[PDB]
């Protein structure tokens, strides 16, 4: 059975820590984007975005997407990333 085999697979490998690592890397990427490319906030005001191991990090990201007028929400992560990269590129082009 597919579901029974999935429970066996989960015992072979618990993906939780790797999903957590991916979240961290994703958050670090957002932080680098804000710090070096979007630069929407004052540097003093990026502290909450920077605190990537916080369980409240998504709340801050939601405020960030609002603050830069991103048309996507956090739940649409792939679209938010692409949009923020597009914004970063347009901000970067022409010094
Ligand atoms: Cl998030």
Residue numbers in the entry: 0 to 94
Q: Which sentences did the original study use to describe this structure?
A:
The human RtcB ligase ortholog RTCB, also referred to as HSPC117 or FAAP, is part of an essential heteropentameric tRNA ligase complex (tRNA-LC), along with the DEAD-box helicase DDX1, as well as FAM98B, CGI-99 (also known as RTRAF or hCLE), and ASHWIN (ASW). The tRNA ligase complex is an essential factor for both tRNA biogenesis and XBP1 mRNA splicing during the unfolded protein response in human cells. By contrast, the RtcB ligases are GTP-dependent enzymes that catalyze the direct joining of RNA strands with terminal 2′,3′>P and 5′-OH. RTCB is the only subunit of tRNA-LC that is essential and sufficient for RNA ligation, but it requires the protein cofactor Archease for multiple-turnover catalysis.
Structural modeling using Phyre2 and PCOILS servers predicted that both CGI-99 and FAM98B comprised N-terminal calponin homology (CH)-like domains followed by putative C-terminal coiled-coil regions. To verify this experimentally, we determined the crystal structure of the N-terminal domain of CGI-99 comprising residues Phe2-Asp101CGI-99 at a resolution of 2.0 Å. The protein construct adopts a globular fold connected via a flexible linker to an N-terminal α-helix comprising residues Phe2–Asn18CGI-99, which is stabilized in different conformations in the two molecules present in the asymmetric unit by crystal packing interactions. Our structural analysis reveals that the CH-like domain of CGI-99 exhibits closest structural homology to the microtubule binding NDC80-like family of CH domains, as proposed by an earlier study. The N-terminal domain of CGI-99 (Phe2-Asp101CGI-99) was able to co-precipitate a minimal FAM98B construct spanning residues Arg2-Lys184FAM98B, indicating that the CGI-99:FAM98B interaction is dependent on both the N-terminal CH domain and a predicted beta-hairpin motif (residues Glu145-Lys184FAM98B) in FAM98B, and the N-terminal CH domain in CGI-99. Taken together, these results indicate that the formation of the CGI-99:FAM98B heterodimer is mediated by the respective N-terminal regions of the subunits and suggest that the N-terminal CH-like domains of CGI-99 and FAM98B may comprise an independently functioning module within tRNA-LC. In addition, the CGI-99 and FAM98B subunits of tRNA-LC form a stable heterodimer through an independent interaction interface involving their N-terminal domains. This heterodimer further serves as an interaction platform for the recruitment of ASW, the fifth tRNA-LC subunit. There is, however, no evidence to date to indicate that CGI-99 and FAM98B, or indeed tRNA-LC, interact with MTs or other cytoskeletal proteins.
